[PDB]
Amino acid sequence: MDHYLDIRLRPDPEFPPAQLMSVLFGKLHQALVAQGGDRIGVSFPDLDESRSRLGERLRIHASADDLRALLARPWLEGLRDHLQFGEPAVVPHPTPYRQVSRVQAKSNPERLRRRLMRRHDLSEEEARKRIPDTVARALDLPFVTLRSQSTGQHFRLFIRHGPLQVTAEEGGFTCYGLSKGGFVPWF
């Protein structure tokens, strides 16, 4: 948790940086699935909250051995043209800590209706009267878009950075680098 690595997307005349962020996020997700562990953080250093923009850099917070095994992992092949990074250097000492969370949404009423077919065996009109079409959630948060090998549907992953606290809390990290209770420094 002491070391951090900054991966900045080198600009591309072919792609706007959102797809580069999505590809890098999927590749680090595959690397974290293959490696294992939950002490690997994810931040966004130039996260502007004005238009919910992700930015153009990405920050990874982890230990020395975990980051060495991450760079030793062959997930980084094919991404050297679009990204550039320094070294896993230590974080500064007086840095406030904030959390990172994946905030999903119930954007499809029909998905929850099909869920309620599998739980109470209700009819279609009972689903429409119980759950209207206005239950869809619009989320104004920065997000990346991804597809999975297990589930072929294309899903959106919203990322939200928490309020800036004064100390860190002992918590794990998900395979996406999002926190199930963990915290990451901010600088």
Binding site: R10, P11, D12, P13, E14, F15, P16, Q19, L20, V23, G26, K27, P74, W75, E77, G78, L79, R80, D81, H82, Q84, R147, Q149, G152, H154
Partner: protein, 298 residues
């Protein structure tokens, strides 16, 4: 006076065929003959068109043929014969200065790295390019590159590379006919979604005959990405050789006409007022003449 011709149509050199795609397995690419091509499928999400590999495949099989013609300085339709003679003299002077050395090397790079695999290369951990030289229906000389070592930003050298460079340079000079069958091999993953060129069911993906394909002009725009002599800032790599150096991803146009670095001002300096530009600027000018255009006044 020696004014610019009113019509200055230039044909495209390095004609690309319509690039297909197909699916298959790595370490079976030596037997990549009857590989089943991926198909554009309509899926209801509103219905949109999606193209992806099957379950028993992890490698793409994008195949296209490139023909190197020659006569780059010759316009197809020139209004003025004196301007055509002066421009042919200028292009021949460029050929005596360098015999299509750097341009053919950078075009052999854009063949060697799979830049024609636009979005099929970003998520690939292993990219391979095979280039066969078809002459009288037979493979005269084969090549098998690697896009992982040959980066998309730097402009290096390699022995088989230089062999492809002399072949493309001999095609561009006019000393022979070069026809190259280029087959790509990118390990995009098991069943992952690929990116064909998109036709305009809100959005459809372009195909040819029961098999999805990439457009020829996409392969051409990928091959033109040799331009690094623009006033580069913010660490951007090569851009496509276009008039007024424009890119759609950044939404901006390098080689601005308020600077004296766009293609048309460099032409009117080179062939009208005899103000010969730098070696890099004339490299960019001959690359834009290779790609063709509708150049001329009104």
């Amino acid at each position: 006076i020696l004014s610019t011709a009113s019509v200055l149509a230039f044909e495209r050199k390095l004609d690309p065929s319509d690039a297909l795609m197909s699916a298959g397995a790595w370490a079976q690419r030596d037997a990549s003959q009857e590989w089943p091509a991926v198909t554009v499928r309509e899926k209801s999400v509103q219905t949109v068109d999606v193209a992806n590999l099957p379950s028993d495949a992890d490698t793409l099989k994008v195949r296209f043929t490139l023909r190197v013609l020659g006569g780059a300085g010759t316009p197809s339709a020139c209004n003025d014969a004196a301007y055509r003679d002066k421009l042919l003299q200028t292009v021949a002077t460029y050929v005596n200065d360098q015999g299509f050395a750097e341009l053919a090397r950078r075009y052999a790079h854009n063949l060697a790295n799979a830049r024609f695999l636009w979005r099929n290369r970003v998520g690939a951990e292993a990219v391979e390019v095979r280039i066969n030289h078809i002459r009288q229906g037979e493979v005269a000389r084969a090549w098998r590159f690697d896009a992982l070592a040959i980066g998309l930003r730097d402009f290096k050298a390699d022995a088989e590379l230089d062999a492809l460079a002399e072949l493309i340079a001999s095609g561009l000079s006019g000393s022979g006919h070069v026809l190259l069958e280029v087959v790509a091999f990118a390990r995009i993953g098991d069943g992952q979604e690929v990116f064909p060129s998109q036709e305009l069911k809100s959005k459809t993906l372009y195909s040819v005959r029961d098999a999805a394909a990439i457009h020829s002009q996409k392969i051409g725009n990928a091959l033109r990405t040799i331009d690094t002599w623009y006033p580069d800032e913010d660490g951007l790599g090569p851009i496509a050789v276009e008039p007024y150096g424009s890119v759609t991803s950044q939404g901006k146009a390098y080689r601005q006409p308020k600077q004296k670095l766009d293609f048309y001002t460099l032409l009117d300096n080179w062939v009208l007022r005899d103000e010969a530009p730098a070696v890099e600027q004339q490299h960019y000018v001959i690359a834009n003449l290779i790609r063709g255009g509708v150049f001329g006044e009104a």
